[PDB]
Design a protein around this ligand. Sequence first.
Ligand SMILES: OC[C@H]1O[C@H](OCC[C@H]2CO2)[C@H](O)[C@@H](O)[C@@H]1O
Ligand SMILES: [Ca+2]
Length: 516
Amino acid sequence: AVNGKGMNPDYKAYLMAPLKKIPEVTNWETFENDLRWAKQNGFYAITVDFWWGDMEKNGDQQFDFSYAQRFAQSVKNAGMKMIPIISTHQCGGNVGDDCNVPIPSWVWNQKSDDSLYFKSETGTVNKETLNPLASDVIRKEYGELYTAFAAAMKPYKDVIAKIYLSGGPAGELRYPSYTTSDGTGYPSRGKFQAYTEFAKSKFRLWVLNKYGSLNEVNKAWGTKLISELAILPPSDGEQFLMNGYLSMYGKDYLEWYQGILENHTKLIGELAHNAFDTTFQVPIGAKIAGVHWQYNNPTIPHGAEKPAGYNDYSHLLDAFKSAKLDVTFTCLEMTDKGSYPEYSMPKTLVQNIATLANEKGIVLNGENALSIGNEEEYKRVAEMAFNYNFAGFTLLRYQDVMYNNSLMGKFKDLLGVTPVMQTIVVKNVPTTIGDTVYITGNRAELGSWDTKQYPIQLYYDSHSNDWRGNVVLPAERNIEFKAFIKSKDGTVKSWQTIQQSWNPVPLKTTSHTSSW
Ligand SMILES: OC[C@H]1O[C@H](OCC[C@H]2CO2)[C@H](O)[C@@H](O)[C@@H]1O
Ligand SMILES: [Ca+2]
C-alpha cells in the first residue's frame, strides 16, 4: 500500500440490507438463514436504514421502534452484528430507490416560513430532508430521536458494531443539488440550493457579521451594492462556476455554503455522541457523497461538487475530525474517464479524500456507488480499499449477492477477507548504502505487482543480519510475491531470483522465510 505499508489490520466487510422492510421482501426465518450465509462469505455486519418516517410517523414523540427491535433480534439470532443508520432522510427519489418513505409530515407544520426545505436557482423545492439551516428544529428533533433510539436499542447493545447518522439527502452530508426534478441529474452541472428567503437572510447576516457594514463589504468585494438587500446568492450559477467563484464574493459565498454543512456535522455529531457514547461505546460515522462528474471540466471546474457543498475537502474533513465522526466515501469500484461530456474523475477523487483522511488521522470507509455485477469491479474496489488504508467496505446491496452464488463467491475471495499479521523474511540481500528493500505480489493486498507506489517496505534486522517486516496479509488466500531492491534515486535495482508463495496464508501468525 502507499507509503510502503500494508492493508488496514482493522478491515472488515459489511452488507447493505434491503431498502424495504424484511417481511416485505422475504421473511424473518429466511433472513436469519441469509445472515449466516453472508457471515460465511466474510461479511462482519449488516448495515440497515431505520427510516425516520417509520419511527416517528404519527406525531411528535409518537415513536415506534418495534421494527428496529425485531430486526435486531433476528441479527442476534443469526449470530451477526449490525450498523444501524438513523435515516432522517426520505426513501425514494434517488438513484436505485425502490421504496417510498418520506420523513414525518407533521415536521413541516413546525415552521411558518421556508426555513425547513430547499429551493434551487430555478425555484425547485426539495423536501427529502431538513435544511441544515434550521438548526433549532434539527437540534430538537434529532436530539429527541437519537436519545429515544438509544433507549430502545439498549437491550441489543451487544449486536451493534457502529452507528451511522444521516447528514442529508440519501444519507450523505450534502445539498440536494443533483435531481431529475431540478434537471440536475448526472452528468449535468449541479444547482445551488440556497434560494429560500431563509437562506438569503442567513447569508446576508453572515456577511454583515464578517464585515460589520455594507461599506466594508463593498470594500472587501470591490463591489458597489447600494443597500444590504443586494447581498444575495449567485444570480447565475453557471456564470458563477465559470468565474464568479474566483472573486472575493465568490470565495465568501462558498465559505458560507459549505460552512453550513460543517456546522451541521458538528451539531449532529455532538447530539449523537451525547446520546450513544455511554451506553454503546461504538464508533459513529457519517457519509460524504462521491460527486465525480464535471470534475475536470475546463469551463466549469467541479461544476457538480460545488453545488453539492463540496468546495474544500480538507476543510470539510476537519469538521468530521472535530465532531469525532468516522467518514464514509463512495465510488470505489469506478475509474477515471475525465472526458467530454461527463468529465468524470471517480478514481482521482477517492485517492484525494483517502490521502486527506489518512493525513488527518480520520478512519476511512468506502462503499460502491452502483450494483456490482462483475468481478472486474470487485478487483477495482480491492485495489483502492487495500492500498488506501480503508478500515471497511460496505457492499450495496443485499439481494445482489444473496441470490447469486457466483458474485457471492468472487466477493468472498476478493473482498470478504480476514487480515492477519505475518512476518516476511528475506535472506542475504545484496544491499549497499541507500538501498531499501520491498516486496510486491499478485493480490491487491500486496500491491498487485506495482513497485512504484504500492510495494510494502522491509527493514533490516541488525541482530539477525537480514531484511524482514511484519506484514498484514489476507488469511487463507494463496499469494505470490517477490522482494526487490530499490536504490537511493528511487529506481528498482534488482529482483529476488525465485518467485515466492504462501498457499494459503496461515490463519495464525507465523513467518515466511526465503533467500535472495
Ligand atoms: O441503504 C443505504 C443508502 O442507500 C442509498 O444511497 C445510495 C448509496 C449512498 C448514497 O449511500 C439510498 O438512496 C439511501 O436512502 C440509503 O440510506
Ligand atoms: Ca420529536
